[PDB]
Structure formats: structure tokens, C-alpha cells
């Protein structure tokens, strides 16, 4: 009978409630015990609902601490805010002073960059002689730096951009003199034509800073000719950009195996000043999909470089620009998928007749180029604020990231008086900086530096130099590490506590009810 | 009998201990089991004491993470460190050179600010002609900026302070030229007379920075007359303040809908330099009373502005100053409760006879004003270190706050040579900066700027300009969020675990003991 198996289950059950209900000999007692069991079950269900809501929200746990594990010395990328060499600039200025027609000056120089530059300028000069008053803004934009870098072979620009031998006067790292040929690596940037990345080399010339990196850089432009009248020199001024005409050094501190993005990251150092960069290293560790969002590699790029979120964001911006305006923005990296896309500033379609006549067709082509630039700029400004587009690129922060916080300070490097005399003797007497440009291919630069950097005018001429002092301020690394807050083990413990508190069941107690229902199914 | 109900309770109990004690057939066994039960209960009570101590301490849980949700572009407030216009300053200097008696110069100018200024100065000049040697410090303090701003109608000062049209040469945001009349909002500050707050306007003149905000500001004072002798010009120098005579621009980056407090927050930019402000946005979320302390609104102010702790602290300081010295400090906001309180620097009670004779009554009134200023300064310095007073103002950090960490760097903006020529042509050839002051009401300023900013001396004159470059360095926001560490659900789970481990009770097991005590009360 049903009562027989009910009585049996009541006598060998480990459940705490239904033994009272089954053996109850009074109706009111049965009602009371059934209500107690139902209330306990309902409250248990509510508490487990809260528990499971906490668990499947996958919360994160974060700890911030200082650890003694050392990080490698960061890579330092230095970019002179002046793109071209001083001698080349003076040559161009004097050539234009002698004859302002760029067409006649194409064959006047054997330097390849000068020839390409004058050809490119001549393809616009007749328009510039006729339409200054009507479209002054257009010609300012066309003659910007990015136009030349997008239309002239970078290997040709590199012959006239700032050279490493003429940029880094001296270097010191870890108490040893730096090897300029082995430690510095040249890279091309569309705005800062030549840039150099320093990669640390630990000791196997025992001099210099022991706890960091120091270098003296020639960054000023006081040796350039001072024109009595305002004259346009295309390729010098990026019209109305945030860095349009600044003077100094752009310094970017980044992890050793990453590509620097100088126009959106880094610090500025003016000429005539000594800058101290106190680095406080940081490390961030993040959790994967279920609890967070992190990635080990760039979705758009290859695996030859360490992942940074900036690279992914910039490549996403370039991808959205290419699809909309049909051309790639020269201010962003070229996606490593397809390289058949032309820069938005490409102008090789300009006819040769634009060198001779200011025809309306040349003006229409100029307007088309201006409109393409405007399209690229418009897409640049708005795409970052569009969350729907940005989220589609799946740019997630790195799972293991090293970051640097920099303390920035400035001193006046060449001190007035005797210490400045010592600095001048160190630069020109011991290092013999001028003698590095007494070579045939740079004879003109030698005379300029010999006249400019003479002993008599050392107080004013030395202001064109700048010094960087990059060092690690704190040896301990501030580590921020993510972890799962509510593990499955903790979930099991919480479930066990709730089950014991409210109803008293165990999982082998469920085996008892399984036996009971087997018995009922057999009896039925 | 008692033994009958005891035996019953022993046979249908789900408690683990008292069945042994009740059915024990040996005295030593009864003693052992009773000791076991008592020890288990005592240890359970100790563990629950620890658990409840942890719970009612209301601990907090904090997580630091980077999120892609974008924050709005911050408001930028720029305040020229020179309070008055250059032309007004030159006019005042030349008027004093022609005649050093301010009384005779009251009717010499039709400019309202000049008339009020000369009246105010004449109310002190006879004392200044007699008591320099005896009280040099008093006259320096009286002739400070804050005295004039507290005694002259701000709408009158605004006619002579730095004007927006003569301060912001150019502006660019999100790849578009800024509208100076619609985007900039003028506000009055007692030390920096005229200040302007930029409020971002997203694109619906496609030029400029795409990822931030850039502007060129006229901040230098090289066009001021160079006197051959030291002459006092009241209203210029705030005597021995920390910003007493600095030159440049004060820049404050703050959330878009908040009031800037330039004298205690912001950054400095010298003239002739280009400053880069790399913003790393942050967001902080805080928990309410039981676990923390946070507020959504300012206790002292209205609801028209977003809450910041600085506003509450400054209003608390003003409240404590008003109660003590009986006057409000002009360097702090005026409480929006009562505005009948006079500034501590108010001096409208000075008789007109002080314009003509250096009577002892005028000196006594000057000493009274000096003592009032000293009272205000003394209360300012000590109130912040008095924790009892500060805690009474109930100033708590905002429950949801947006903060910005700024990377600060400097470049030399107008580069020597050709790029500086391009910058000069951009400022004066294309934008035509001088032509904005060729209007009748500013004819005198036109001649000064035409002479000063000529082509011949562009290398030196352009050093009076400065450029700001404000951009968001990291798109991801570093979010710090508070949460309750020990919820009531976790407390219930821990209580259940402890109860199961030590004694094995469940809450329906308590129903069994309730039934037992009902039976005992019925039997008794």
C-alpha cells in the first residue's frame, strides 16, 4: 500500500521535514508542519535565486599591489619636430630666393629629394600664383607635410630628413656609451619624417648615467636663414594642426616591442631645456571572455608586434575611413590586409600641363583633392564617438599589459657661465660634433655649423640643443591583476550552506527520494 | 510524564546531539555527550560572533577596470594671468605719468572703468603719499586685485578686462573651427577678472585637430610700456600671493557641467610655449550610507550644477569665515543662502575727505580694513586642519564622479625660421588678427598691435602667444566602482555553513524544539 512505503520512507529518511508531516497524528499538526516545509522551501528558492544571479553575473576580483619583479627597460622613440635637415631647408630657401619659379629649379640640384620636391611644387605653382586671394585655405592644406610624405618615395625623403648622426649628439645607458648604429632603429612617420627608436642593450666606455638613459639632441632651428619677407616653403607647415609649428623633440615611452604612435602619444621637450622622465612601471593582468574582455593579438595585424589597444583602435579607424571615402588616411597605419588602397592625399593623376597654365581643370582637380581630404577628416572626427561602429572591430584591452607613468620636469640645460662652457667643450671639444659633418657629402652643413656654433656666441647657439634624462623612478612594479570573484567551488559552498540552513538536504539525501520514487513507480 | 515527551522528542528529532544525551544509558556517556554538545555550541557561538562582527562592519568591495564606455569631452576653462586689457593698462600708465594725482584724472577719461578706478585710487592716494616708509606692507595689500573686484561692479570691470575677441586667436575642435560666440562662456573670478569656459559642440570649416581641442591664445605682455622707474599701478599685483605676478594662461580641465575654481585647481602654460594636455579619463562610483559616505548634491548650493567635493569644501570654508570675521572672503564662492554679507575687502564706508587730507581717521579705517583682511586670512589657513569643524559640514565625495588625469608637456610653439614665418602668416595674414581690433571702439589697440606685431620683429613679438593642445590620450575609461563586500545572502550562506558544521541544526529543526517546548508548556 501507499501508506506502507510512506511509513518506511518516513522511518529511514534523512530529510528533516517530511518525517513530521507523514507521521503526523493531528490535522492541525500536519497543516503546521506542511506550512513550515513550504515556507522553508520558498525562502530557500529565493536565496538560491539570489545566489545564482550573483554567480552568472561572473563578477571580477581586482588586487593592486607592488611587486619586486622587474620589467624590461622601455623603448624610447624620439622624433624631431623639424622634419627636414637644416642644410636642405636653407638650400631650398636660397634656391627660391634666387628664382621663385619651381619649374626652372628642377634641374638645378643633383639631390634626388630636391628634384622630386621641385617637380611636386611645380605641379601646383601656377595655381598658387593665381588663386591665393580666392582660396588661401586650400593652398595651405595642399602644401602641408602629409602631402609630400604621401606622394614621394620614403626612401627618397630619408635622404633629406633628419639624420641620426646629425640628431643624437651623445647617448648613455646603464653606465655605458650607446652604440648609435646598433641601438637606434629608424622608422618613417608621415608627419615626423624621420624617427628613431632606442632599444636597450645591457652591458656585457664606462661613463654616463647608471640607473637610466640620457642623450643630448640637436632640436633647435636657430641656424635657419631669417628672411626679411614672409615666404611660403611647402612641406614645412602642417596647416592648423595641433602640432603645426612647434619646436623641440617628441618623446614616446612604450613597451620595448611595440610600434610608437607619436601624433597621439608621448611627451614634448623644448630646445634649450633638460627634461627628466621619471618612469613608474605598471603591469595589468586581465581575465578572458566569461568574466571580462581581453585579447592577446591584434585582429587586424600580424603577430610580429606586441599587442596594444591603440593599434587596434587606429586600424579600426583606418578600416572605417577606407570603406567610406574610398581612400586610406596617411595619418593612420595602413591595414596589413590590402595595400592597393591609395592615400587620400595621392595626387599623381595631376597632368603635366598644370606646371605651365592655371587651367580650370587643374583647379577642379585641386578641389577634388581638397574634398577627399575633407572626407577623411570628417570621418576621423566622428567615428570614435560612434559606439556601434567601434564595438564591431572587437578591440579589447590586452590580457597582459605593461604601462608606464612618467613624471615630467624641465631644467635649463646649458647653464650660463662656466658650467655652460664645460658643456660646450664636452659637445664640441671632446665629442667633436662638427667633425661628424666635415665629410664630403655634408660639406655645406660643416660650414653652417662651424659659423653658428662658434665659441663667441655659445650662450645663444647652445640653446638649440636639448637633453633627455629617462630613468626608472621606482624599482617596484605596481601590479593590477584581475581574477574571478565567485568560483564554482565558492558557489558549491554557498549552495551547501543555504541547503543545510533552510531544508537540511544533502545530495545523497536526494538518493533517498530517488529510491522513494523508484519504489512508488514499482508499486504503481 | 516528562520522560515520555523526552523520549518522543529523542525519537523524532533531527538534532544530532540531544538524542545521544536523552537516550544515554550510562552516566559517563551522558557526561561525555553533554560536554561534546556544549563545546560544539560554544565554538559555534564564537564563530558566529566573528561572522556578525564581519557583517556589521559593512565592508566595501572595489574593482578597478578599463571600460569602452566613452565619457563626454571635458569643459576647458582658460584664464589669462593678466587681468586687464593691454590698452587699458597703457592708458592708465600714461595718465599717471602725465599726472600722478589720481583725483585730477577722474574726469580725464570717458571709460567707466577708468573713472571708477581713479575714484577708488584717489580715496587712498593721500595716505599712500605719507605712509610708505611706515606701513609699506599695508598699501601693497590694499592695492591688490581683490580689492578692486570686491568694490567695483563686475559689469564695469568686464569692459576693461581681457576680451574674448582679443584673447582667443583661433580654436579648433573635432576637425571643425570653433564658434567663439556660441562655444565660449564668460565667467567672473575675483583674481582672474575675465575667464572663459569652452563647452564642446559636436559636428553637425573642416579643419584642425580631429581627436581633441586646440587653440592659440594671446597671453604675453611684451607690448606694455617699459617704464624707466618703478611706479605703482594699483589693481595689477596681488601682493605676495602664490600667483602674484606670473605670466601665461591658467587652464582648468573639469567635467562639462561644473564650476571651475581656477586658484586651487588647473595647470599653467607660459607664453611662447605649446602645451599638450593628454587626458586619461576616470570614473568613480561609490556606495551610500551603510557601507560608505557619498552625496549626489551640494548641501550648501542649489541643483543647477553637478556636484564636486571642492565646491562643498569651499562653501564650508566660506560659512566658517562668515561666522567668525563677520564678512565673506572674496576668494571663495558666496553661499547661496544669504547675499547681504559684505566682502571682507569692502571699503565703501571710506569718507570722501580721504581724497584730500591724510587724516588719522582715514588711517584708522585703513588699519581696520587691514585687520579684517588679516582675520579672513587667518581663518582661511586654520579651518581646513580642524577636523571637528570640517566634519560638521557633511561634505562627502560624489556617488558618481568623472575625473581626468592629465599628461603635461611643453614645446616652443613659434619655431625659429620658416615654420615661424608660416605661423605668423596664419595668425596675421589669413586670420587677420589685427583687423578684429580696427573697429572704432578699439582704435588705440589697433595701432599698438600693428606696431608691435610687425613682420620685422616677428621672432620676438610672437613669443607673447601660446597654444593649448587638449586631447583624450586613452579612449578607454579607468572605472573604480565600490560595492558591498558581504551581502545578506552571503551572511545567510555563512551562517548555514557554520550551523551545519558545528551543530547540524536547520531552521525547521527549530520548529521541532518549538513543538517540544509547546508540549512541555502544555504538560506543565
Amino acid at each position: 500500500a501507499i501508506r506502507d512505503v510512506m511509513t518506511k520512507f518516513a522511518e529511514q529518511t534523512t530529510m528533516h521535514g517530511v518525517p513530521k508531516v507523514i507521521n503526523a497524528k493531528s490535522s492541525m499538526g500536519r497543516l503546521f508542519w506542511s506550512l513550515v516545509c513550504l515556507a522553508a522551501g520558498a525562502m530557500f528558492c529565493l536565496q538560491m535565486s539570489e545566489v545564482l544571479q550573483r554567480y552568472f553575473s561572473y563578477p571580477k576580483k581586482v588586487t593592486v599591489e607592488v611587486v619586486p619583479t622587474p620589467v624590461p627597460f622601455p623603448s624610447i622613440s624620439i622624433c624631431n619636430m623639424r622634419n627636414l635637415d637644416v642644410h636642405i631647408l636653407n638650400t631650398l630657401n636660397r634656391m627660391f630666393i634666387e628664382d621663385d619659379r619651381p619649374f626652372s629649379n628642377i634641374n638645378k640640384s643633383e639631390h634626388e629629394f630636391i628634384r622630386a620636391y621641385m617637380k611636386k611644387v611645380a605641379k601646383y605653382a601656377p595655381l598658387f600664383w593665381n588663386y591665393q586671394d580666392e582660396y588661401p585655405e586650400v593652398f595651405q592644406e595642399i602644401f602641408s607635410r602629409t602631402t609630400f610624405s604621401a606622394n614621394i618615395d620614403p626612401e627618397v625623403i630619408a635622404l633629406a630628413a633628419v639624420q641620426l648622426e646629425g640628431f643624437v649628439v651623445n647617448c648613455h645607458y646603464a653606465g655605458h656609451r650607446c652604440n648609435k648604429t646598433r641601438d637606434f632603429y629608424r622608422f618613417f612617420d608621415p608627419y615626423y619624417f624621420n624617427c628613431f627608436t632606442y632599444k636597450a642593450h645591457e652591458p656585457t666606455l664606462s661613463e654616463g648615467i647608471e640607473n637610466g638613459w640620457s642623450s643630448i639632441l640637436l632640436s633647435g632651428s636657430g641656424m635657419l636663414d631669417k628672411n626679411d619677407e614672409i615666404r611660403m616653403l611647402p612641406g614645412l607647415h602642417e596647416w592648423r594642426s595641433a602640432v603645426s609649428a612647434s619646436e623641440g623633440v617628441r618623446v614616446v615611452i612604450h613597451p620595448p616591442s611595440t610600434t610608437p604612435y607619436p601624433f597621439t602619444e608621448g611627451y614634448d621637450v623644448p630646445p634649450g631645456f633638460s627634461a627628466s622622465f621619471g618612469i613608474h612601471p605598471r603591469r595589468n593582468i586581465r581575465i578572458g571572455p566569461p568574466h571580462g574582455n581581453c585579447s592577446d593579438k591584434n585582429p587586424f595585424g600580424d603577430g610580429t608586434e606586441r599587442y596594444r589597444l591603440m593599434a587596434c583602435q587606429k586600424m579600426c579607424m583606418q578600416h572605417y575611413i577606407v570603406e567610406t571615402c574610398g581612400c586610406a588616411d596617411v595619418g593612420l597605419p595602413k591595414l596589413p590586409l590590402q595595400a592597393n588602397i591609395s592615400w587620400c592625399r595621392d595626387d599623381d593623376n595631376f597632368p603635366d600641363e598644370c606646371m605651365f597654365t592655371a587651367s580650370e581643370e587643374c583647379l577642379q582637380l585641386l578641389m577634388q583633392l581638397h574634398n577627399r581630404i575633407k572626407c577623411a577628416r570628417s570621418i576621423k572626427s566622428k567615428i570614435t564617438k560612434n559606439t556601434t561602429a567601434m564595438e564591431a572591430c572587437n578591440c579589447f584591452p590586452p590580457c597582459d599589459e605593461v604601462s608606464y607613468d612618467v613624471s615630467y620636469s624641465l631644467s635649463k640645460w646649458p647653464s650660463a657661465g662656466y658650467e655652460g662652457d664645460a658643456a660646450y667643450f664636452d659637445v664640441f671639444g671632446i665629442e667633436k660634433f662638427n667633425e661628424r659633418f666635415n665629410k664630403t657629402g655634408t660639406q655645406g652643413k660643416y660650414e653652417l655649423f662651424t659659423k653658428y656654433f662658434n665659441v663667441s656666441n655659445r650662450e645663444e647657439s647652445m640653446k638649440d640643443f636639448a637633453r633627455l634624462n629617462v630613468y626608472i623612478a621606482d624599482s617596484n612594479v605596481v601590479k593590477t591583476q584581475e581574477s574571478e570573484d565567485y568560483t564554482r567551488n565558492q558557489l558549491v559552498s554557498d549552495i551547501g550552506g543555504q541547503l543545510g540552513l533552510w531544508v537540511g538536504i544533502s545530495l545523497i539525501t536526494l538518493a533517498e527520494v530517488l529510491e522513494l520514487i523508484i519504489d512508488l513507480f514499482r508499486l504503481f | 510524564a516528562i520522560r515520555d515527551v523526552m523520549t518522543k522528542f529523542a525519537e523524532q528529532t533531527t538534532m544530532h546531539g540531544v538524542p545521544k544525551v536523552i537516550n544515554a544509558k550510562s552516566s559517563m556517556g551522558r557526561l561525555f555527550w553533554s560536554l561534546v554538545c556544549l563545546a560544539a555550541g560554544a565554538m559555534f557561538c564564537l564563530q558566529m560572533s566573528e561572522v556578525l562582527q564581519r557583517y556589521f562592519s559593512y565592508p566595501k568591495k572595489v574593482t578597478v577596470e578599463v571600460v569602452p564606455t566613452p565619457v563626454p569631452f571635458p569643459s576647458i576653462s582658460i584664464c589669462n594671468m593678466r587681468n586687464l586689457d593691454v590698452h587699458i593698462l597703457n592708458t592708465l600708465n600714461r595718465m599717471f605719468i602725465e599726472d600722478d594725482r589720481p583725483f585730477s584724472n577722474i574726469n580725464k577719461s570717458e571709460h567707466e572703468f577708468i573713472r571708477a578706478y581713479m575714484k577708488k585710487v584717489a580715496k587712498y592716494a593721500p595716505l599712500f603719499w605719507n605712509y610708505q616708509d611706515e606701513y609699506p606692507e599695508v598699501f601693497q595689500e590694499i592695492f591688490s586685485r581683490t580689492t578692486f573686484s570686491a568694490n567695483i561692479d563686475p559689469e564695469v570691470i568686464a569692459l576693461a578686462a581681457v576680451q574674448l575677441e582679443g584673447f582667443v586667436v583661433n580654436c579648433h575642435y573635432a576637425g571643425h573651427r570653433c564658434n567663439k560666440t556660441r562655444d565660449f562662456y564668460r565667467f567672473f573670478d575675483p583674481y582672474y577678472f575675465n575667464c572663459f569656459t569652452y563647452k564642446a559642440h559636436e559636428p553637425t570649416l573642416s579643419e584642425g585637430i580631429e581627436n581633441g581641442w586646440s587653440s592659440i591664445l594671446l597671453s604675453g605682455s611684451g607690448m606694455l610700456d617699459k617704464n624707466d622707474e618703478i611706479r605703482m599701478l594699483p589693481g595689477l599685483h596681488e601682493w605676495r600671493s602664490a600667483v602674484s605676478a606670473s605670466e601665461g594662461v591658467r587652464v582648468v580641465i573639469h567635467p562639462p557641467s561644473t564650476t571651475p575654481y581656477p586658484f586651487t585647481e588647473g595647470y599653467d602654460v607660459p607664453p611662447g610655449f605649446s602645451a599638450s594636455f593628454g587626458i586619461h579619463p576616470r570614473r568613480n562610483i561609490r556606495i551610500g550610507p551603510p557601507h560608505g559616505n557619498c552625496s549626489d548634491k551640494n548641501p550648501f548650493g542649489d541643483g543647477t550644477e553637478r556636484y564636486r567635493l571642492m565646491a562643498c569644501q569651499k562653501m564650508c570654508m566660506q560659512h566658517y569665515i562668515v561666522e567668525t570675521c563677520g564678512c565673506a572672503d572674496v576668494g571663495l564662492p558666496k553661499l547661496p543662502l544669504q547675499a547681504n554679507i559684505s566682502w571682507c575687502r569692502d571699503d565703501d564706508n571710506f569718507p570722501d575727505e580721504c581724497m584730500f587730507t591724510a587724516s588719522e581717521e582715514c588711517l584708522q579705517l585703513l588699519m581696520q580694513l587691514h585687520n579684517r583682511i588679516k582675520c579672513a586670512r587667518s581663518i582661511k589657513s586654520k579651518i581646513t586642519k580642524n577636523t571637528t569643524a570640517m566634519e560638521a559640514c557633511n561634505c562627502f565625495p560624489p556617488c558618481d564622479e568623472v575625473s581626468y588625469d592629465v599628461s603635461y608637456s611643453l614645446s616652443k610653439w613659434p619655431s625659429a625660421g620658416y615654420e615661424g614665418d608660416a605661423a605668423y602668416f596664419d595668425v596675421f595674414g589669413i586670420e587677420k588678427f589685427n583687423e578684429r581690433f580696427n573697429k572704432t571702439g578699439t582704435q588705440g589697440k589697433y595701432e599698438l598691435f600693428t606696431k608691435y606685431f610687425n613682420v620685422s620683429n616677428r621672432e620676438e613679438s610672437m613669443k607673447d602667444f601660446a597654444r593649448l593642445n587638449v586631447y583624450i590620450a586613452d579612449s578607454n575609461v579607468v572605472k573604480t566602482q565600490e560595492s558591498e563586500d558581504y551581502t545578506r545572502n552571503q551572511l545567510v550562506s555563512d551562517i548555514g555553513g557554520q550551523l551545519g558544521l558545528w551543530v547540524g541544526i536547520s531552521l525547521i529543526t527549530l520548529a521541532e524544539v518549538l513543538e517540544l517546548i509547546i508540549d512541555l508548556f502544555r504538560l506543565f
Partner: peptide, 5 residues
């Protein structure tokens, strides 16, 4: 404006 190269 007339500016010349």
C-alpha cells in the same frame, strides 16, 4: 600682398 614661394 602677393605671397611668393
Amino acid at each position: 600682398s602677393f605671397v611668393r614661394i
